[PDB]
Swiss-Prot record, chains A, B:
Official protein name in the record: Thymidylate kinase
Gene expressing this chain: DTYMK
Oligomer status and interactors: Homodimer.
Catalytic reaction(s) noted: dTMP + ATP = dTDP + ADP
Function: Catalyzes the phosphorylation of thymidine monophosphate (dTMP) to thymidine diphosphate (dTDP), the immediate precursor for the DNA building block dTTP, with ATP as the preferred phosphoryl donor in the presence of Mg(2+).
Keywords: Acetylation, ATP-binding, Disease variant, Intellectual disability, Kinase, Neurodegeneration, Nucleotide biosynthesis, Nucleotide-binding, Transferase
Cellular component GO terms, alphabetical: cytoplasm; cytosol; mitochondrion; nucleus
Listed pathway(s): Pyrimidine metabolism; dTTP biosynthesis
BP-aspect Gene Ontology terms: cellular response to growth factor stimulus; dTDP biosynthetic process; dTTP biosynthetic process; dUDP biosynthetic process; thymidine biosynthetic process
Length: 209, 209
């Protein structure tokens, strides 16, 4: 009985990382075999290149960096498939959608070009999108010092995310991330249990194909 | 007056590297500003990952390695555009065509997926394809120890190259690489001078778009 592939995407400071950690914890506490993944996965060779870029310690040509972000997902695909086939549900903090939305926020990057490298990746069974109004995100401290951490760029990324959500091949669920950490968590947890229960029914799909 | 972008592609041991070096030398000797490039460009961070893979010192997931080969071209695009805009002709030993042909020789890699990462790269003004019958390539010593250096895989790559050559958006020229080094060189040199003279007329194109 395979595991589910659940991705969390969402606006700046909406709580992707907090909710992904809490979700894995709660699923395991409820008897599921679930494990957390995140992209970028900064531990691999490619992941280090990406981390340096995001910290502004290095500059990387925009197309090159886009392909490295995708390659960083592909190198984890054998693991993702193995775990899911072993019945382990994977909760993933960001995935190909952030890949497309952030590069697509740059000038002269079509959504189509941005999607292609990720075509064929394991298709998520559930894509949660954590929505939060900017006034509310602002109360969540201040921007970080990493690349892309500024309102105007975030806004362009958000427009890209909205285009991706028009894709009905994907099980997108909107989450109101303005509530408390615990309230948001319960919303996510229940959506997740439902997905886990239905994923054991159809084979793992391929993204964007 | 911009430089031309000339790529050399071709079968195993057909003489891509020998002819690219000789071409640059001859162009410079004839008053052109020309410089040699090669892919993979093994000197960069990404290039080292690729070199390790090709030497079989490391294993890389097939999709990841494909995207690294493309990223290795993109990271050189600012240089390529700068040089061409300065009037420097660039002679390139392998390019996106080898990228597509070698990954596309693997099982379950469509030509379409393989092309996408490279869509938008500087379009070559001239693509030379060095053709050589296997009996003739065999007289050119023995296979190397690197990955992909075996007859069956080379044959599949060759079929992919033939599909790419159906693309009329590109100025493909076939070269009979069975002749002597000097004879092949003269054929290439003359094709190249012609291209250099016409490239100063239309802007640099974008590949596969
Ligand atoms: N529902 C919430 N209410 C209030 N604060 C929250 C909530 N969720 C997260 N936070 C806090 O806001 C900050 C951002 O949380 P985090 O889960 O790291 O966001 P994120 O969505 O991963 N942001 P980023 O990865 O930078 O886009 C952290 O200090 C969290 O404790
Ligand atoms: N026309 C030719 N006649 C005879 N030997 C040749 C010719 N061209 C190249 N060679 C030799 O064959 C070997 C392969 O040449 P080289 O130019 O390195 O090929 P290549 O096309 O780059 N092969 P590879 O990069 O391995 O696909 C070298 O020893 C060359 O000296
Ligand atoms: C997974 C992924 C993330 N990103 C971005 C989103 C984030 N930048 N911001 N803001 C950054 C990762 O931030 P975190 O490491 O905090 O998740 O990289 C890409 O640009 N492409 C990708 O493929
Ligand atoms: C440029 C490029 C080369 N290649 C291959 C062709 C070659 N393998 N063989 N045989 C190898 C480079 O060989 P040379 O370094 O000798 O040119 O990488 C790819 O697989 N993808 C690419 O994008
Ligand atoms: Mg986070
Ligand atoms: Mg397409
Ligand atoms: Mg060579």
């Amino acid at each position: 009985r395979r595991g589910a592939l659940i991705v969390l995407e969402g606006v700046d400071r909406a709580g992707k990382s907090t909710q992904s950690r809490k979700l894995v914890e709660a699923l395991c506490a409820a008897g599921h075999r679930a494990e957390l993944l995140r992209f970028p996965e900064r531990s691999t060779e490619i992941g280090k290149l990406l981390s340096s870029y995001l910290q502004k310690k290095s500059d990387v040509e925009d197309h090159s960096v886009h392909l490295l972000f995708s390659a960083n997902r592909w190198e984890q695909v054998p693991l993702i498939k193995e775990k899911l086939s072993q019945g382990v549900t994977l909760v993933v903090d960001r995935y190909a959608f952030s890949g497309v939305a952030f590069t697509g926020a740059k000038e002269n990057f079509s959504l189509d070009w941005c999607k292609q490298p990720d075509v064929g990746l394991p298709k998520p069974d559930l894509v949660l999108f954590l929505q939060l109004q900017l006034a509310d995100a602002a109360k969540r401290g201040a921007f970080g010092h990493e690349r892309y951490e500024n309102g105007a760029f975030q806004e362009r990324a958000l427009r890209c995310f909205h285009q991706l959500m028009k894709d009905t091949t994907l099980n997108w669920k909107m989450v109101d991330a303005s509530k408390s950490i615990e309230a948001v968590h319960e919303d996510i947890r229940v959506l997740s249990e439902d997905a886990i229960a239905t994923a054991t029914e159809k084979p793992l799909g391929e993204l964007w194909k």
